[PDB]
Amino acid sequence: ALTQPPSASGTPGQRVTISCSGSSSNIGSNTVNWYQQLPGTAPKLLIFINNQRPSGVPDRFSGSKSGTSASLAISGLQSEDEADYYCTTWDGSLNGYVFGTRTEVTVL
Amino acid sequence: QVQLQESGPGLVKPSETLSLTCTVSGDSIRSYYWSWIRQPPGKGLEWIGHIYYSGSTNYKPSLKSRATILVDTSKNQFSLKLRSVTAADTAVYYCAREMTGVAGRGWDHWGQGTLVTVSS
Amino acid sequence: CDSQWLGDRVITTSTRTWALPGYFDFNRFHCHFSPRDWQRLINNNWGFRPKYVLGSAHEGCLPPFPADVFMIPQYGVPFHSSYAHSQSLDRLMNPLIDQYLYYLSKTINGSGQNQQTLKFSVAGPSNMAVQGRNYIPGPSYRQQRVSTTVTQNNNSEFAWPGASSWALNGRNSLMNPGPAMASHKEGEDRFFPLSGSLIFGKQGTGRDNVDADKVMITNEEEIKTTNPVATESYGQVATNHQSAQAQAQTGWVQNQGILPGMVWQDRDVYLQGPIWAKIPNFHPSPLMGGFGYSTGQVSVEIEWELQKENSKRWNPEIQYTSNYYKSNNVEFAVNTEGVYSEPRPIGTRYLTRNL
Amino acid sequence: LPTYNNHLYKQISNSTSGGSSNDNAYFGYSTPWGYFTDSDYQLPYVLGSAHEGMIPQYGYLTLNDGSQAVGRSSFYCLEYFPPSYRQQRVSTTVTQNNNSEFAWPGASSWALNGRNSLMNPGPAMPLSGSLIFGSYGQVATNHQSAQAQAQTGWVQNQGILAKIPHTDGNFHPSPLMGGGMKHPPPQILIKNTPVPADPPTAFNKDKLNSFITQ
Amino acid sequence: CDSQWLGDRVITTSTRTWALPGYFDFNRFHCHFSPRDWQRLINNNWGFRPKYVLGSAHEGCLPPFPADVFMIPQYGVPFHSSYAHSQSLDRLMNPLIDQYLYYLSKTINGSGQNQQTLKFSVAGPSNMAVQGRNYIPGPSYRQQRVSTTVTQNNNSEFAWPGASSWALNGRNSLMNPGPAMASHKEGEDRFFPLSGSLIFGKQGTGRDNVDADKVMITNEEEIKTTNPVATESYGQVATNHQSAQAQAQTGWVQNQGILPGMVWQDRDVYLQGPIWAKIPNFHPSPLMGGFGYSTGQVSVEIEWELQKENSKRWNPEIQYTSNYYKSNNVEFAVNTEGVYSEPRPIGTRYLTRNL
Amino acid sequence: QSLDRLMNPLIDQYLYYLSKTINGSGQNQQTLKFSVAGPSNMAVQGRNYIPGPSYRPVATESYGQVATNHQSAQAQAQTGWVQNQGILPGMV
Amino acid sequence: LPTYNNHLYKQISNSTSGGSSNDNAYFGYSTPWGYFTDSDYQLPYVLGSAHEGMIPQYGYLTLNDGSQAVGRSSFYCLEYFPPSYRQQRVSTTVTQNNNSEFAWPGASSWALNGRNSLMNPGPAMPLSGSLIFGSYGQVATNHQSAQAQAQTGWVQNQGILAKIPHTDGNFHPSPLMGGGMKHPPPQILIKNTPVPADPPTAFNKDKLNSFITQ
Amino acid sequence: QSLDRLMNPLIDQYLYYLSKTINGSGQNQQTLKFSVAGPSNMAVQGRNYIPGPSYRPVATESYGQVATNHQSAQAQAQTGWVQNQGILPGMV
């Protein structure tokens, strides 16, 4: 798995940072990408290939990767952003995908 | 347009083989990897494995020898089969498509997912 | 436009409408064959054959759909095999019977000092690797192996640097497609030779830096029975002379030319593929496959000779079929906006023969 | 001419042989027939493999994967008819030979579809080179210059400068073990027509497994 | 034994060894055709035809595999269509044009009292179901619907009680297979008429009370375009007179006899199925399909007339093919024990025709 | 002869029919069992031809029964009587 | 004779009109042709449907599931050529008729593959009974006896006691709207051969979409 | 004319080649990219015929390079030099 904080939270408008970490053979090599899963439905793709993102996704969501740690960035937090978040990456050692533990976002 | 739908028996007796099929509609399965990812209720996600439209197959290492994935290009449908199931296998199984025709970089589209319960 | 099917002959008539702002090039198959006709061909027949800038596989050929109006570009034989061997070159033996020949089984009696010995054994069903064979697979010139699982691939720009090339008078030319070779080993689909196989673009594909899903990569896998794998070494050689002092030493054959006793299959032809090429030699068969303002109408007619399938095979063949599932639009037809498209590259090898 | 397989066609694989190993993997069938004539060469042609032969049994290999059959495999019911590549040098003087097992490791081979096949007898020119019964030169490797000496290197392999298999191409079709025809002498197949023993006295749909030895 | 494919005719020859402790029955197709020959027939042709207890579909017929020796049992025409329509009886219209006919669109101007009114509209592409048609689907005699997922069936023994049947002189005869009706609606592959479909045993299946995986259930889905579904009511009829005092009422048609203007497809034939039957009438074509101690050798030779495929269809057809996947053993071939087996029932309906 | 007896009394059919829908009494006993149509049970054999039309074959009786509904876990199988029957292919 | 679809074949379907009705779902193609001849009856025959017809456009329907296309569907490029069933009664005096909407609800309809189709005009004998321009009897239902009176019941439907579709069987093929042949008069197809506008001087690979009105 | 230049200089081939394998900026992540082989780049076009054998085509030079090993995330793609080349189908 990929060590990821259990939950992050903030009032609306504040920048929230989720960061997951892994081994060099894991996230250090290859790349990361972020899925957002609303309760009761399938996951949805926020950020992919570290810093890029899909057209449907809003501008505020942001991604980054540094060394063996990558981080998702949400600017201007909103109530719609309360959901579960996973970071996913390939793993050269396992020769497959690895999912980071889910992180919950709660608006205060 | 690509639409993914999983179908399979909602209930499976312990130590019986589990069987699921995913029928993609609207678009062909050609030139794209396809993967099963699993989620237990209220728990994180596991990646089962994926298959390439021509039949090349890759699995999660711990989960080999209990699992098999087939592809039928004629019916444009795509299958998972899992054996010796236990209560640990009760989960929601998703059918997803690998991104931009290349394996190893996320999943573009996602099936609705189906719940499978192992009980008697 | 139409087709007539008479016995061992086929008459393909193709009429198009053109506009000139020059030459005509009909050298691609889908000019002369509808998909149904092409299917009707490759499923029932073991072979066929018809009765300077063209051979460069350029654009400007008549459109596959007859209702397409197109633009004229500016100017600047044996039966093709359409079958897959049902036997592999190395397995031609009878599995039930020993050969009267012998091979060298043992050079030692075990661990110890001065264990030198010679033992021989019969070549038979037990060990089939060693049996003497009258024929050998054809030549090979190795291609680099690229994976469509990209994390697998090395993280370095090896696109031009690692590609097999031939240099002529100081200019370097990539080897494409090269000698006809099996695309990949059995069970390994995800890999593909760098310049080894023909790559067609899908309908509506961008000119540059397109992704993998926008192109169609053919594979020659059918010929893996008589032809070496394009990404593997043809075999090993002895590089020295053994002695009590020196161990045996071997080396990999990265390229191997013709030898007496080599048999091979040529590269396949496709509905999108070119038909003929002008010979400028050895084995003239072209490496890309096949055989060696104003406006108006243009028609073209070609007679094709066929070789019928005589097989006694009991079980049913692998046949080429149309996919059957609910989809947005019919393959090999027009979308709502009226664009014709060819979703899958189609080969010629389905029916089988003995080796 | 005995009766083989009790008048049965039976598939065989390396698995039926104990499982064997990768280069020795095979799949195919064993037939009741020993060796009408096949004058169209529609059957697998096993005569050019230098097998023995009492009348031997007939049987043929097809395509496989491991011990399993691919869907392209063929099955035939007979009833349904009416320049050098260097070899390692083995000396007959034992002590001159090295004290290590180089019989298979040092042998020159060619690989096809992931299977390694020893090169035997090979081209006409030695471990595997010659039948058994019961370099090419040097080349310039670089440019000479003031600084760089002229360098050379050995040439281990070099190319040109018994039924013939049916293929798009071949060169010098003469077989490597000597003897080469697109239409060799045809095969000739024979078996004893099975005569069943006394059937049961009430009808039964199963095929008859009871036969008179013969 | 062999088959000669000559032009528009086919000649089959089968030779079998027998033992007699009686009569000969060759009436099943796989006697005269090998799977490959059967494939070759059904993919390329729109029709074929040949050139008293036999018609009861009994056992004791010549073995499907020529090397089997069989005990002899004790004693006690138009082309058969082999295609699936590419159109359905209700879609024959042009989608782009209005009919000149009118239908009744509105019987009330809206909610209220004394709102009776009559409005008429053009039958056209917008509302397709209401257009006038010259032909109607064929007759139906409803079958009970059984599911292959057992949890979808109620916990009662309705196998004999719920089955459709006919009675002759005080004896009930189960209706089997019955009139030709589509097996199931689209999207439902797990339902089958209780007695409306032919069911074959897999190799080695036990005589009494076998599980559903031991048998092979044929489906008649191809003929749905022209025939009512076996498990659905043929339609609704007006059961009364409407009035200001009474609502219009309708009822379901469970059985339907021939009406002028019905068209239908007969039942398909299978590799395992019967060939001919003796006529003891209307449309004599039999319901199970087809056309209306000592030892020794038996050989039989049938001449078949063929009907070639004339279609101008552009896109490729559905064909019968052998899947290219690694299995433990080949389909339609013996296993290690020497047992010939037939994996699936092969119906002859792959090619299509306009309706 | 009679229309339903044209079979060989000595020989089975290679066809199958649905013998059992349940293992036995209880809850959740659904199963599917098939059996060979044979001389043991004549009535279930498949027949190529059916008796001719009837308008109330004996004129004082019903032609036969038909299924009136889709069975399911909730609903039992229900049949009804045919008083009149038009022509069908295979009638005599 | 105009120029349809700007010289294009174009897919049309149920959803292209908005769809949403299962009984009205369709799939097919629209052609540039209006209506060479088809003397082999190879194209879908659309004439017998009583359509209108200036020359109308040609288009046809094929198999569908909802608005999508099943594998068995067909596409044709034309360039590639050189007893009663009771009807509900409706009185023309509005008051006599029941004050409810029974136009679709009370119409006699037959179902084919889960699509209900109005029976129109229906057998020759009426809500849907006759063209619009711009019981059978009783039967004994039981056995009479001492205790059981004779019971009877009505007969709503009764069976027997333009191009003809190509099928294994039909009865009295005469079309139901009156007038029916297995080889009717052939269809006649016509279009204006497209004349393109001036092309770009530089070579282009895409097809030419620029044309002259005509 | 020279062997490699037999093409039409004005027109693209409809074949594709592998133009780029590392699309990313800085990280330079491994990606697959393809491009139409055309007058812009003539070195990469697929050719029907190849130059005849060479034993050290200029005899003072190497006939070309071939790939020595399988690339992998760990290993670089490595090419050797062809000093001598026998006959191959399509040589002239």
Side-chain angles (χ1 to χ4, degrees), chain A residues 33 35 37 88 94-95 97 99, chain B residues 39 45 58 98 104-107:
Chain A
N33 60 346
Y35 288 95
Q37 180 192 33
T88 300
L94 299 175
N95 194 33
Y97 287 96
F99 276 92
Chain B
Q39 183 177 0
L45 276 61
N58 191 339
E98 299 292 321
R105 252 137 222 197
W107 299 275

mmCIF file with all atom_site columns, all heavy atoms in Angstrom, chain A residues 33 35 37 88 94-95 97 99, chain B residues 39 45 58 98 104-107:
data_model
loop_
_atom_site.group_PDB
_atom_site.id
_atom_site.type_symbol
_atom_site.label_atom_id
_atom_site.label_alt_id
_atom_site.label_comp_id
_atom_site.label_asym_id
_atom_site.label_entity_id
_atom_site.label_seq_id
_atom_site.pdbx_PDB_ins_code
_atom_site.Cartn_x
_atom_site.Cartn_y
_atom_site.Cartn_z
_atom_site.occupancy
_atom_site.B_iso_or_equiv
_atom_site.pdbx_formal_charge
_atom_site.auth_seq_id
_atom_site.auth_comp_id
_atom_site.auth_asym_id
_atom_site.auth_atom_id
_atom_site.pdbx_PDB_model_num
ATOM 1   N N   . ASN A 1 33  ? -1.402  9.101  -9.537  1.00 0.00 ? 33  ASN A N   1
ATOM 2   C CA  . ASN A 1 33  ? -2.579  9.846  -9.946  1.00 0.00 ? 33  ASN A CA  1
ATOM 3   C C   . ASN A 1 33  ? -3.692  9.656  -8.927  1.00 0.00 ? 33  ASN A C   1
ATOM 4   O O   . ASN A 1 33  ? -3.687  8.698  -8.155  1.00 0.00 ? 33  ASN A O   1
ATOM 5   C CB  . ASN A 1 33  ? -3.024  9.448  -11.337 1.00 0.00 ? 33  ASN A CB  1
ATOM 6   C CG  . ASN A 1 33  ? -3.379  8.023  -11.441 1.00 0.00 ? 33  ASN A CG  1
ATOM 7   O OD1 . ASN A 1 33  ? -3.075  7.229  -10.562 1.00 0.00 ? 33  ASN A OD1 1
ATOM 8   N ND2 . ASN A 1 33  ? -4.022  7.668  -12.535 1.00 0.00 ? 33  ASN A ND2 1
ATOM 9   N N   . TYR A 1 35  ? -7.722  9.652  -7.491  1.00 0.00 ? 35  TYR A N   1
ATOM 10  C CA  . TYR A 1 35  ? -9.128  9.372  -7.722  1.00 0.00 ? 35  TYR A CA  1
ATOM 11  C C   . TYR A 1 35  ? -9.966  9.895  -6.572  1.00 0.00 ? 35  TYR A C   1
ATOM 12  O O   . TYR A 1 35  ? -9.576  9.793  -5.409  1.00 0.00 ? 35  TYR A O   1
ATOM 13  C CB  . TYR A 1 35  ? -9.391  7.889  -7.895  1.00 0.00 ? 35  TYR A CB  1
ATOM 14  C CG  . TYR A 1 35  ? -8.886  7.341  -9.188  1.00 0.00 ? 35  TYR A CG  1
ATOM 15  C CD1 . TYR A 1 35  ? -7.650  6.752  -9.275  1.00 0.00 ? 35  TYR A CD1 1
ATOM 16  C CD2 . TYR A 1 35  ? -9.657  7.409  -10.326 1.00 0.00 ? 35  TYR A CD2 1
ATOM 17  C CE1 . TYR A 1 35  ? -7.195  6.253  -10.453 1.00 0.00 ? 35  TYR A CE1 1
ATOM 18  C CE2 . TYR A 1 35  ? -9.209  6.911  -11.510 1.00 0.00 ? 35  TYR A CE2 1
ATOM 19  C CZ  . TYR A 1 35  ? -7.978  6.333  -11.570 1.00 0.00 ? 35  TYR A CZ  1
ATOM 20  O OH  . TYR A 1 35  ? -7.526  5.832  -12.762 1.00 0.00 ? 35  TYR A OH  1
ATOM 21  N N   . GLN A 1 37  ? -13.631 9.428  -4.807  1.00 0.00 ? 37  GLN A N   1
ATOM 22  C CA  . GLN A 1 37  ? -14.810 8.573  -4.783  1.00 0.00 ? 37  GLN A CA  1
ATOM 23  C C   . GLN A 1 37  ? -15.908 9.040  -3.841  1.00 0.00 ? 37  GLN A C   1
ATOM 24  O O   . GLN A 1 37  ? -15.752 8.994  -2.626  1.00 0.00 ? 37  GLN A O   1
ATOM 25  C CB  . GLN A 1 37  ? -14.425 7.142  -4.416  1.00 0.00 ? 37  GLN A CB  1
ATOM 26  C CG  . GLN A 1 37  ? -15.607 6.191  -4.378  1.00 0.00 ? 37  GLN A CG  1
ATOM 27  C CD  . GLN A 1 37  ? -15.264 4.860  -3.750  1.00 0.00 ? 37  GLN A CD  1
ATOM 28  O OE1 . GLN A 1 37  ? -14.443 4.785  -2.838  1.00 0.00 ? 37  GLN A OE1 1
ATOM 29  N NE2 . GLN A 1 37  ? -15.892 3.799  -4.232  1.00 0.00 ? 37  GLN A NE2 1
ATOM 30  N N   . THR A 1 88  ? -2.904  6.515  -6.596  1.00 0.00 ? 88  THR A N   1
ATOM 31  C CA  . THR A 1 88  ? -2.643  5.227  -7.210  1.00 0.00 ? 88  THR A CA  1
ATOM 32  C C   . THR A 1 88  ? -1.363  5.299  -8.018  1.00 0.00 ? 88  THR A C   1
ATOM 33  O O   . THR A 1 88  ? -1.073  6.322  -8.637  1.00 0.00 ? 88  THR A O   1
ATOM 34  C CB  . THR A 1 88  ? -3.790  4.829  -8.117  1.00 0.00 ? 88  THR A CB  1
ATOM 35  O OG1 . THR A 1 88  ? -4.987  4.750  -7.346  1.00 0.00 ? 88  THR A OG1 1
ATOM 36  C CG2 . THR A 1 88  ? -3.530  3.494  -8.744  1.00 0.00 ? 88  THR A CG2 1
ATOM 37  N N   . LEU A 1 94  ? 6.148   -5.106 -7.517  1.00 0.00 ? 94  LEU A N   1
ATOM 38  C CA  . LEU A 1 94  ? 5.009   -6.008 -7.582  1.00 0.00 ? 94  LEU A CA  1
ATOM 39  C C   . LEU A 1 94  ? 4.545   -6.223 -9.007  1.00 0.00 ? 94  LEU A C   1
ATOM 40  O O   . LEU A 1 94  ? 3.762   -7.141 -9.265  1.00 0.00 ? 94  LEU A O   1
ATOM 41  C CB  . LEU A 1 94  ? 3.872   -5.451 -6.746  1.00 0.00 ? 94  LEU A CB  1
ATOM 42  C CG  . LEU A 1 94  ? 4.289   -5.320 -5.293  1.00 0.00 ? 94  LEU A CG  1
ATOM 43  C CD1 . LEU A 1 94  ? 3.197   -4.662 -4.500  1.00 0.00 ? 94  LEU A CD1 1
ATOM 44  C CD2 . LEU A 1 94  ? 4.614   -6.682 -4.741  1.00 0.00 ? 94  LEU A CD2 1
ATOM 45  N N   . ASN A 1 95  ? 4.999   -5.390 -9.935  1.00 0.00 ? 95  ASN A N   1
ATOM 46  C CA  . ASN A 1 95  ? 4.547   -5.448 -11.320 1.00 0.00 ? 95  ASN A CA  1
ATOM 47  C C   . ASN A 1 95  ? 3.034   -5.291 -11.397 1.00 0.00 ? 95  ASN A C   1
ATOM 48  O O   . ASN A 1 95  ? 2.338   -6.097 -12.008 1.00 0.00 ? 95  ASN A O   1
ATOM 49  C CB  . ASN A 1 95  ? 4.997   -6.742 -11.991 1.00 0.00 ? 95  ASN A CB  1
ATOM 50  C CG  . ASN A 1 95  ? 4.856   -6.698 -13.487 1.00 0.00 ? 95  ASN A CG  1
ATOM 51  O OD1 . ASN A 1 95  ? 5.011   -5.649 -14.102 1.00 0.00 ? 95  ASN A OD1 1
ATOM 52  N ND2 . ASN A 1 95  ? 4.555   -7.839 -14.087 1.00 0.00 ? 95  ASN A ND2 1
ATOM 53  N N   . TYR A 1 97  ? -0.501  -2.379 -9.984  1.00 0.00 ? 97  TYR A N   1
ATOM 54  C CA  . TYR A 1 97  ? -0.924  -1.140 -9.357  1.00 0.00 ? 97  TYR A CA  1
ATOM 55  C C   . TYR A 1 97  ? -1.009  -1.277 -7.848  1.00 0.00 ? 97  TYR A C   1
ATOM 56  O O   . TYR A 1 97  ? -1.225  -2.362 -7.327  1.00 0.00 ? 97  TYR A O   1
ATOM 57  C CB  . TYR A 1 97  ? -2.274  -0.702 -9.908  1.00 0.00 ? 97  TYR A CB  1
ATOM 58  C CG  . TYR A 1 97  ? -2.214  -0.169 -11.313 1.00 0.00 ? 97  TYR A CG  1
ATOM 59  C CD1 . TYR A 1 97  ? -2.486  -0.985 -12.395 1.00 0.00 ? 97  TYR A CD1 1
ATOM 60  C CD2 . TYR A 1 97  ? -1.887  1.151  -11.558 1.00 0.00 ? 97  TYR A CD2 1
ATOM 61  C CE1 . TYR A 1 97  ? -2.432  -0.497 -13.683 1.00 0.00 ? 97  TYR A CE1 1
ATOM 62  C CE2 . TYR A 1 97  ? -1.830  1.646  -12.841 1.00 0.00 ? 97  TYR A CE2 1
ATOM 63  C CZ  . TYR A 1 97  ? -2.104  0.820  -13.898 1.00 0.00 ? 97  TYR A CZ  1
ATOM 64  O OH  . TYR A 1 97  ? -2.047  1.313  -15.178 1.00 0.00 ? 97  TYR A OH  1
ATOM 65  N N   . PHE A 1 99  ? -2.713  0.761  -4.376  1.00 0.00 ? 99  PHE A N   1
ATOM 66  C CA  . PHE A 1 99  ? -3.622  1.802  -3.933  1.00 0.00 ? 99  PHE A CA  1
ATOM 67  C C   . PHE A 1 99  ? -3.280  2.286  -2.542  1.00 0.00 ? 99  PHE A C   1
ATOM 68  O O   . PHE A 1 99  ? -3.078  1.495  -1.632  1.00 0.00 ? 99  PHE A O   1
ATOM 69  C CB  . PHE A 1 99  ? -5.054  1.283  -3.920  1.00 0.00 ? 99  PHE A CB  1
ATOM 70  C CG  . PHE A 1 99  ? -5.738  1.346  -5.248  1.00 0.00 ? 99  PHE A CG  1
ATOM 71  C CD1 . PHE A 1 99  ? -5.701  0.272  -6.110  1.00 0.00 ? 99  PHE A CD1 1
ATOM 72  C CD2 . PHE A 1 99  ? -6.430  2.477  -5.626  1.00 0.00 ? 99  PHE A CD2 1
ATOM 73  C CE1 . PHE A 1 99  ? -6.336  0.325  -7.331  1.00 0.00 ? 99  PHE A CE1 1
ATOM 74  C CE2 . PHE A 1 99  ? -7.068  2.538  -6.845  1.00 0.00 ? 99  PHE A CE2 1
ATOM 75  C CZ  . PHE A 1 99  ? -7.021  1.461  -7.701  1.00 0.00 ? 99  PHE A CZ  1
ATOM 76  N N   . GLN B 2 39  ? -13.326 -3.691 -4.172  1.00 0.00 ? 39  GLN B N   1
ATOM 77  C CA  . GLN B 2 39  ? -13.353 -2.968 -2.916  1.00 0.00 ? 39  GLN B CA  1
ATOM 78  C C   . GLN B 2 39  ? -14.214 -3.675 -1.888  1.00 0.00 ? 39  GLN B C   1
ATOM 79  O O   . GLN B 2 39  ? -15.387 -3.954 -2.147  1.00 0.00 ? 39  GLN B O   1
ATOM 80  C CB  . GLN B 2 39  ? -13.907 -1.572 -3.142  1.00 0.00 ? 39  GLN B CB  1
ATOM 81  C CG  . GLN B 2 39  ? -13.908 -0.724 -1.922  1.00 0.00 ? 39  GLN B CG  1
ATOM 82  C CD  . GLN B 2 39  ? -14.401 0.659  -2.211  1.00 0.00 ? 39  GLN B CD  1
ATOM 83  O OE1 . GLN B 2 39  ? -14.746 0.979  -3.340  1.00 0.00 ? 39  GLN B OE1 1
ATOM 84  N NE2 . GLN B 2 39  ? -14.419 1.501  -1.198  1.00 0.00 ? 39  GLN B NE2 1
ATOM 85  N N   . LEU B 2 45  ? -9.197  0.147  -1.784  1.00 0.00 ? 45  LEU B N   1
ATOM 86  C CA  . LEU B 2 45  ? -9.319  -0.528 -3.061  1.00 0.00 ? 45  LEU B CA  1
ATOM 87  C C   . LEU B 2 45  ? -8.153  -1.476 -3.285  1.00 0.00 ? 45  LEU B C   1
ATOM 88  O O   . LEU B 2 45  ? -7.008  -1.177 -2.949  1.00 0.00 ? 45  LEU B O   1
ATOM 89  C CB  . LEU B 2 45  ? -9.369  0.496  -4.185  1.00 0.00 ? 45  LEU B CB  1
ATOM 90  C CG  . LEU B 2 45  ? -10.714 1.120  -4.515  1.00 0.00 ? 45  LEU B CG  1
ATOM 91  C CD1 . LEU B 2 45  ? -11.254 1.851  -3.335  1.00 0.00 ? 45  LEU B CD1 1
ATOM 92  C CD2 . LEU B 2 45  ? -10.542 2.087  -5.642  1.00 0.00 ? 45  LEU B CD2 1
ATOM 93  N N   . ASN B 2 58  ? -2.073  -9.972 -16.559 1.00 0.00 ? 58  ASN B N   1
ATOM 94  C CA  . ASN B 2 58  ? -1.243  -9.659 -15.411 1.00 0.00 ? 58  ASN B CA  1
ATOM 95  C C   . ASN B 2 58  ? -2.116  -9.637 -14.168 1.00 0.00 ? 58  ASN B C   1
ATOM 96  O O   . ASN B 2 58  ? -3.264  -9.201 -14.222 1.00 0.00 ? 58  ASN B O   1
ATOM 97  C CB  . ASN B 2 58  ? -0.556  -8.330 -15.607 1.00 0.00 ? 58  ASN B CB  1
ATOM 98  C CG  . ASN B 2 58  ? 0.506   -8.082 -14.599 1.00 0.00 ? 58  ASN B CG  1
ATOM 99  O OD1 . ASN B 2 58  ? 0.519   -8.678 -13.531 1.00 0.00 ? 58  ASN B OD1 1
ATOM 100 N ND2 . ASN B 2 58  ? 1.424   -7.201 -14.931 1.00 0.00 ? 58  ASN B ND2 1
ATOM 101 N N   . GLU B 2 98  ? -8.183  0.776  -18.662 1.00 0.00 ? 98  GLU B N   1
ATOM 102 C CA  . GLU B 2 98  ? -6.892  1.432  -18.583 1.00 0.00 ? 98  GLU B CA  1
ATOM 103 C C   . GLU B 2 98  ? -6.848  2.607  -19.545 1.00 0.00 ? 98  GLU B C   1
ATOM 104 O O   . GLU B 2 98  ? -7.593  2.666  -20.520 1.00 0.00 ? 98  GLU B O   1
ATOM 105 C CB  . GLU B 2 98  ? -5.793  0.445  -18.924 1.00 0.00 ? 98  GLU B CB  1
ATOM 106 C CG  . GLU B 2 98  ? -5.736  -0.731 -17.997 1.00 0.00 ? 98  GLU B CG  1
ATOM 107 C CD  . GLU B 2 98  ? -5.307  -0.372 -16.627 1.00 0.00 ? 98  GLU B CD  1
ATOM 108 O OE1 . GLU B 2 98  ? -4.409  0.478  -16.505 1.00 0.00 ? 98  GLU B OE1 1
ATOM 109 O OE2 . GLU B 2 98  ? -5.849  -0.951 -15.668 1.00 0.00 ? 98  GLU B OE2 1
ATOM 110 N N   . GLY B 2 104 ? -0.534  0.724  -17.087 1.00 0.00 ? 104 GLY B N   1
ATOM 111 C CA  . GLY B 2 104 ? 0.277   1.397  -16.092 1.00 0.00 ? 104 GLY B CA  1
ATOM 112 C C   . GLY B 2 104 ? 0.016   2.857  -15.780 1.00 0.00 ? 104 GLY B C   1
ATOM 113 O O   . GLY B 2 104 ? 0.748   3.445  -14.994 1.00 0.00 ? 104 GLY B O   1
ATOM 114 N N   . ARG B 2 105 ? -1.000  3.461  -16.382 1.00 0.00 ? 105 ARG B N   1
ATOM 115 C CA  . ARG B 2 105 ? -1.284  4.856  -16.062 1.00 0.00 ? 105 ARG B CA  1
ATOM 116 C C   . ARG B 2 105 ? -2.741  5.197  -15.770 1.00 0.00 ? 105 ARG B C   1
ATOM 117 O O   . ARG B 2 105 ? -3.384  5.917  -16.525 1.00 0.00 ? 105 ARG B O   1
ATOM 118 C CB  . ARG B 2 105 ? -0.710  5.790  -17.123 1.00 0.00 ? 105 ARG B CB  1
ATOM 119 C CG  . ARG B 2 105 ? 0.495   6.545  -16.609 1.00 0.00 ? 105 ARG B CG  1
ATOM 120 C CD  . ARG B 2 105 ? 1.618   6.604  -17.619 1.00 0.00 ? 105 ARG B CD  1
ATOM 121 N NE  . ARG B 2 105 ? 2.890   6.369  -16.953 1.00 0.00 ? 105 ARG B NE  1
ATOM 122 C CZ  . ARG B 2 105 ? 4.072   6.663  -17.472 1.00 0.00 ? 105 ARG B CZ  1
ATOM 123 N NH1 . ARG B 2 105 ? 4.152   7.220  -18.670 1.00 0.00 ? 105 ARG B NH1 1
ATOM 124 N NH2 . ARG B 2 105 ? 5.175   6.408  -16.785 1.00 0.00 ? 105 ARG B NH2 1
ATOM 125 N N   . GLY B 2 106 ? -3.251  4.680  -14.659 1.00 0.00 ? 106 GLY B N   1
ATOM 126 C CA  . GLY B 2 106 ? -4.608  4.967  -14.239 1.00 0.00 ? 106 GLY B CA  1
ATOM 127 C C   . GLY B 2 106 ? -5.692  4.274  -15.030 1.00 0.00 ? 106 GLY B C   1
ATOM 128 O O   . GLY B 2 106 ? -5.424  3.417  -15.864 1.00 0.00 ? 106 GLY B O   1
ATOM 129 N N   . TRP B 2 107 ? -6.931  4.670  -14.773 1.00 0.00 ? 107 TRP B N   1
ATOM 130 C CA  . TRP B 2 107 ? -8.079  4.113  -15.459 1.00 0.00 ? 107 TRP B CA  1
ATOM 131 C C   . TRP B 2 107 ? -8.942  5.270  -15.915 1.00 0.00 ? 107 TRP B C   1
ATOM 132 O O   . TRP B 2 107 ? -9.234  6.175  -15.145 1.00 0.00 ? 107 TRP B O   1
ATOM 133 C CB  . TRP B 2 107 ? -8.859  3.188  -14.533 1.00 0.00 ? 107 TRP B CB  1
ATOM 134 C CG  . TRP B 2 107 ? -8.055  2.034  -14.061 1.00 0.00 ? 107 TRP B CG  1
ATOM 135 C CD1 . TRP B 2 107 ? -7.872  0.851  -14.700 1.00 0.00 ? 107 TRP B CD1 1
ATOM 136 C CD2 . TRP B 2 107 ? -7.303  1.958  -12.852 1.00 0.00 ? 107 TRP B CD2 1
ATOM 137 N NE1 . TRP B 2 107 ? -7.060  0.035  -13.960 1.00 0.00 ? 107 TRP B NE1 1
ATOM 138 C CE2 . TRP B 2 107 ? -6.697  0.693  -12.818 1.00 0.00 ? 107 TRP B CE2 1
ATOM 139 C CE3 . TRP B 2 107 ? -7.090  2.833  -11.788 1.00 0.00 ? 107 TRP B CE3 1
ATOM 140 C CZ2 . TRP B 2 107 ? -5.894  0.283  -11.767 1.00 0.00 ? 107 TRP B CZ2 1
ATOM 141 C CZ3 . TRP B 2 107 ? -6.293  2.424  -10.750 1.00 0.00 ? 107 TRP B CZ3 1
ATOM 142 C CH2 . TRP B 2 107 ? -5.704  1.162  -10.745 1.00 0.00 ? 107 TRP B CH2 1
#
